[PDB]
Amino acid sequence: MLRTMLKSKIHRATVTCADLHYVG
Amino acid sequence: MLRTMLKSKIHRATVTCADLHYVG
Amino acid sequence: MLRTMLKSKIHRATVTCADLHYVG
Amino acid sequence: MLRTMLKSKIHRATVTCADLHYVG
Amino acid sequence: XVTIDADLMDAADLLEGEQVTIVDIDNGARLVTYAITGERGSGVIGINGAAAHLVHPGDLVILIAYATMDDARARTYQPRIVFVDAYNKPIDIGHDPAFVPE
Amino acid sequence: XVTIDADLMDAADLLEGEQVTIVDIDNGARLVTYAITGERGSGVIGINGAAAHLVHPGDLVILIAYATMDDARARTYQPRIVFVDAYNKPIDIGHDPAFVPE
Amino acid sequence: XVTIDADLMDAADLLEGEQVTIVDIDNGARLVTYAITGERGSGVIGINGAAAHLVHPGDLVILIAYATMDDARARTYQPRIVFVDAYNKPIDIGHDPAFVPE
Amino acid sequence: XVTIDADLMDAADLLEGEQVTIVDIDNGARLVTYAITGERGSGVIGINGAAAHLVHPGDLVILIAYATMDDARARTYQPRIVFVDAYNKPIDIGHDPAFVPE
Ligand SMILES: [N+]
Ligand SMILES: [N+]
Ligand SMILES: [N+]
Ligand SMILES: [N+]
């Protein structure tokens, strides 16, 4: 039987940019 | 082949606190 | 490698009851 | 241990039709 | 959650407790829950608890379950597709999610 | 996230870090997070961070975890169903997600 | 659901029935469904049923599938990234989800 | 999606392409995407495409990845928890998702 477990957390990170046309 | 099955349920629990700045 | 695949579909089913206080 | 990884991407595709009564 | 006629669960290869996605044709709601066995032959599609905020009696819904499987198996896998009538009785069972009867 | 009384985690077979779906009876919110161990016996059901936008103190919530398993195992699998009282103390543990006590 | 040109499914390593996430550049909708094979070479990206509440004709969408795999495999895994033109014809196939042609 | 400083990906044990849940402290948005490697040491947390409908520059976000594993392994599993400063530089790495430094 398989459980789903938290493995990574980066917390209270500040978004540096957010735009509809940027791809990555 | 793998199925996804309910394994745990805690029901009609009352939320004791809920705040944006608490971490855990 | 594992893929996630559709395995069951029941379609255009009519909801017979829907209420906040029924448990199951 | 299993990771969930992106395996397929089709991007900036144009939706050719979208209707509530079409099944597939 | 969702209470499903045992006949419909069997027809669709759904086990009690199996995760199930519900999508609502009438209002577009989409949610994830699990199946609860309903009285066999009653035609019950019952929405219980929290999900009754999003799904209402008389709505047309689609019920979906997924499986995880090896790549080799997925290439030959055949889903269980159950078409029902106005009384939630199974009238057709096949492999094609887009098939409509008559 | 969600901080859960260790007694409730044990009763429900939840591990620290285990993924958990929360659904809110009062407002219909549905979200996915993970369990954090709360002080044993305190009755804490604490909603932390971002999830406090959707869940508020005094709300009635259902906490759900899922397992992935072989088809053969899923046919005999028995969930851990924990019914709690007004103080979030476990009063009944069984196999039936739809069972209600008294 | 979503009906996809068979050419696009092949280019992207999508099987019929494979789970697919759709995100909508125009309105920000995000939903999970499965792929249905569309007429090869037609350029069809068809949204059927409930999902038509959230996605509309002419919208720009991204289609995503995920795989679950062993940690060792995930470190060397290469996705199948398919860039399409204004007519939903595949013009570039590579490993980099952020690559844009010309 | 989300473009993450390579230093942060390494600190958090995230691979390029790995599925990632984003939750937004400021507005409560919750979405699922995948990680894209960002310029090492730049502090980039970039939201690209459709997700920019839900997440805005200057927002405080939490980034989460999950693993699926055998029950025996899950009982001893230790997550990788990365606390960052105002410039998205890693200042603490530990096992406790609820730990806050100083
Ligand atoms: N993108
Ligand atoms: N937190
Ligand atoms: N319930
Ligand atoms: N459909």
Residue numbers in the entry:
A (entry chain A), B (entry chain A), C (entry chain A), D (entry chain A): 1 to 24
E (entry chain B), F (entry chain B), G (entry chain B), H (entry chain B): 25 to 126
Please, what does the article write about this entry?
Here, we present biochemical and structural evidence that POA inhibits Mtb PanD in a competitive fashion and that it binds with a high degree of complementarity to the active site of the enzyme. PanD is a proenzyme and in the structure, we observed the processed active enzyme after cleavage between Gly24 and Ser25, and modification of Ser25 to a pyruvoyl group (Pyr25). The active protein consists of a β chain (Met1-Gly24) and an α chain (Pyr25 to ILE115). Our results show that resistance to PZA in PanD mutants primarily comes from alterations in two loops covering the active site that have subtle, but significant effects on the affinity and residence time of POA on the enzyme rather than from directly affecting POA binding interactions.
We found that POA also bound to the M117I protein with significantly lower affinity compared to the wild type. The Kd was ~200 µM higher for the mutant than the wild type (Kd = 0.90 (0.09) mM, n = 4; Fig. 3a). We crystallized and solved the structure of the M117I mutant protein. PanD M117I crystallized in the I422 space group and diffracted to 2.33 Å resolution. The structure was very similar to the wild-type protein structure with a root-mean-square difference in the cα positions of 0.32 Å. The crystallization condition contained tartrate, a known inhibitor of the enzyme. A molecule of tartrate fit well into electron density in the active site that could not be accounted for by the protein. In the mutant structure, we could fit an additional 11 residues at C-terminus that were not visible in electron density map for the wild-type protein. The ordered C-terminus enabled us to map several additional resistant mutation sites onto the structure, including M117, that were not visible in the wild-type structure. While none of the mutations were in amino acids that directly contacted POA, most were either on the C-terminal loops of the α and β chain or directly interacting with residues from these loops.
